Amino acid sequence: IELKENIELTDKERKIFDRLLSTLRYCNLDTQLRVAGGWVRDKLLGKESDDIDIAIDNMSGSEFLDKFKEYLSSRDEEVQGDTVIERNLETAKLRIYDQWIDFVNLRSEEYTENSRIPTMKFGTAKDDAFRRDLTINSLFYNINSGAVEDLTERGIDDLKSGKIVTPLPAKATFLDDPLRVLRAVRFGARFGFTLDEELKEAASSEEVRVALGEKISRERIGNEIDLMISGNGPVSAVTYLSDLKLFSVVFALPSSAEPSPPENCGSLSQSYLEAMWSLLKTPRPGKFSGEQRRLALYAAMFLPFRKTVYKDTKGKSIPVVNHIFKFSMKRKTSDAETVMNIHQTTERFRSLIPSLEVKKDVELDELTWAADILEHWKSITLNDPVIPATSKIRVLTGFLLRDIKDFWRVSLLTSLLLSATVDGSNGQLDFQLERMRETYLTVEATIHELGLDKIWDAKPLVNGREIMQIAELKGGSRLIREWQQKLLTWQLAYPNGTAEECKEWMRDIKAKRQRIE
Numbered sequence: 001i002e003l004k005e006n007i008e009l010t011d012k013e014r015k016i017f018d019r020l021l022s023t024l025r026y027c028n029l030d031t032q033l034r035v036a037g038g039w040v041r042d043k044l045l046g047k048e049s050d051d052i053d054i055a056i057d058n059m060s061g062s063e064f065l066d067k068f069k070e071y072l073s074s075r076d077e078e079v080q081g082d083t084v085i086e087r088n089l090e091t092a093k094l095r096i097y098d099q100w101i102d103f104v105n106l107r108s109e110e111y112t113e114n115s116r117i118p119t120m121k122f123g124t125a126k127d128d129a130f131r132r133d134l135t136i137n138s139l140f141y142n143i144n145s146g147a148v149e150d151l152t153e154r155g156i157d158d159l160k161s162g163k164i165v166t167p168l169p170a171k172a173t174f175l176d177d178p179l180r181v182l183r184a185v186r187f188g189a190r191f192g193f194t195l196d197e198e199l200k201e202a203a204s205s206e207e208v209r210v211a212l213g214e215k216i217s218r219e220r221i222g223n224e225i226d227l228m229i230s231g232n233g234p235v236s237a238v239t240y241l242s243d244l245k246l247f248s249v250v251f252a253l254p255s256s257a258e259p260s261p262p263e264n265c266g267s268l269s270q271s272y273l274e275a276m277w278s279l280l281k282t283p284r285p286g287k288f289s290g291e292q293r294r295l296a297l298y299a300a301m302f303l304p305f306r307k308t309v310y311k312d313t314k315g316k317s318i319p320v321v322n323h324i325f326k327f328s329m330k331r332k333t334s335d336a337e338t339v340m341n342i343h344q345t346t347e348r349f350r351s352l353i354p355s356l357e358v359k360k361d362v363e364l365d366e367l368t369w370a371a372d373i374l375e376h377w378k379s380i381t382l383n384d385p386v387i388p389a390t391s392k393i394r395v396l397t398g399f400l401l402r403d404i405k406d407f408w409r410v411s412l413l414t415s416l417l418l419s420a421t422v423d424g425s426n427g428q429l430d431f432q433l434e435r436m437r438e439t440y441l442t443v444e445a446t447i448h449e450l451g452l453d454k455i456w457d458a459k460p461l462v463n464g465r466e467i468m469q470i471a472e473l474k475g476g477s478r479l480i481r482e483w484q485q486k487l488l489t490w491q492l493a494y495p496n497g498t499a500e501e502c503k504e505w506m507r508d509i510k511a512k513r514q515r516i517e
Contacts, residue, residue, distance in 0.1 A: 013052070135165040
């Protein structure tokens with residue numbers, strides 16, 4: 001890795017450091033201030049960071065935060081924040097030039113503890129460096145001497161090359177804080193670095209794996225996985241998850257998983273993950289919200305678990321993707337449902353593609369999922385003299401675009417990965433991705449030609465109250481939705497038709513007694 005000679009400072013950092021060095025003299029303090037590890041790494045790597053961690057040598061976070069440098073002919077020195085956090089250590093928080101700078105006190109980490117406030121007291125810079133997660137996050141920048149300190153004697157070397165290494169032995173560390181296993185994979189794939197062989201042999205142990213699935217908050221497990229899928233290279237993170245046999249502990253399936261989890265599900269997840277990652281970084285328009293792209297990678301990764309379900313305490317077969325998001329990762333309920341919507345509306349999108357590439361009715365009458373919509377369409381278009389060949393596909397597409405709301409751009413990409421897999425029991429996706437992009441652009445254009453863009457916001461032509469007016473008194477809240485699904489088929493088939501034009505067809509058809517259903 002091409003590192004920098006020394007640490008280039010910016011206009012705010014330098015200014016902030018200038019005041020910090022002025023307080024050591026205006027108050028005559030003997031303390032050796034120092035930045036924490038996360039900032040020195042990005043600076044030496046040629047990047048920048050807004051997280052400024054300052055460790056105090058012989059002074060508490062709030063103790064040094066109460067040493068305001070006033071009466072120095074300054075520009076009304078006035079901070080914006082001064083929050084202090086206690087415990088049962090004392091960390092102070094400052095706010096200068098719209099920058100959150102927390103003053104942490106150099107302290108050490110104990111071993112004998114219940115994984116909660118193990119810190120006993122503060123000790124030297126070595127004790128604050130060897131408690132860091134990785135060797136690249138254990139570097140200090142002594143702002144009193146302007147030099148870089150490598151107390152681990154491995155960090156500057158492991159940063160010049162690509163290697164994630166724990167300061168202390170990995171297995172002993174991963175038994176005290178097993179979450180550091182996922183933090184190593186997160187930093188190994190973010191910076192494109194490798195993992196030390198003693199770190200791989202420790203993470204792959206049954207002891208560390210059994211210590212990661214038990215006595216470990218799932219919320220934090222899912223919090224690390226979201227940072228992988230929502231970071232630089234998530235493929236590498238997933239690759240390390242399957243190699244170290246952590247894919248089954250992080251994404252744990254429920255016991256009542258029917259059908260049983262197929263063997264080597266990590267091999268099918270990576271292939272879909274690599275394809276999905278290479279199908280969302282080609283055009284690079286910048287109009288792709290992170291959440292949308294983040295949910296897309298989960299959908300492709302969990303695509304083999306699309307047809308497997310589980311039974312909850314109510315005996316309802318719930319898709320397995322619900323147990324992974326709600327119980328194995330403690331994610332938002334919107335993430336669990338959005339992924340499930342993508343998986344269900346995928347097979348229904350794969351059947352409409354051969355018709356959306358030529359804008360014609362290409363075997364749409366035998367679609368088993370649209371047998372109810374076609375029956376609505378065949379009954380309305382029976383008295384039509386000549387009807388276009390696009391009203392059929394516009395209605396069916398105009399119905400699948402109202403269930404995925406605006407997730408049709410991510411669902412269409414997942415349907416292209418299901419149309420490249422062969423039949424069998426080996427059969428795995430192998431199709432070329434050169435014609436896959438072209439397919440995405442051809443279908444997306446057809447949707448736009450048909451005016452179906454955001455067709456999930458178009459108000460209905462006839463409300464529920466007029467439905468009871470035009471129809472008889474015989475009916476109830478199951479009939480309004482019944483009639484509105486038929487009217488939606490009329491609205492999708494006649495795009496330029498009015499509401500009164502639709503009510504004429506409704507008043508005429510009730511005067512003719514012609515069942516559409």
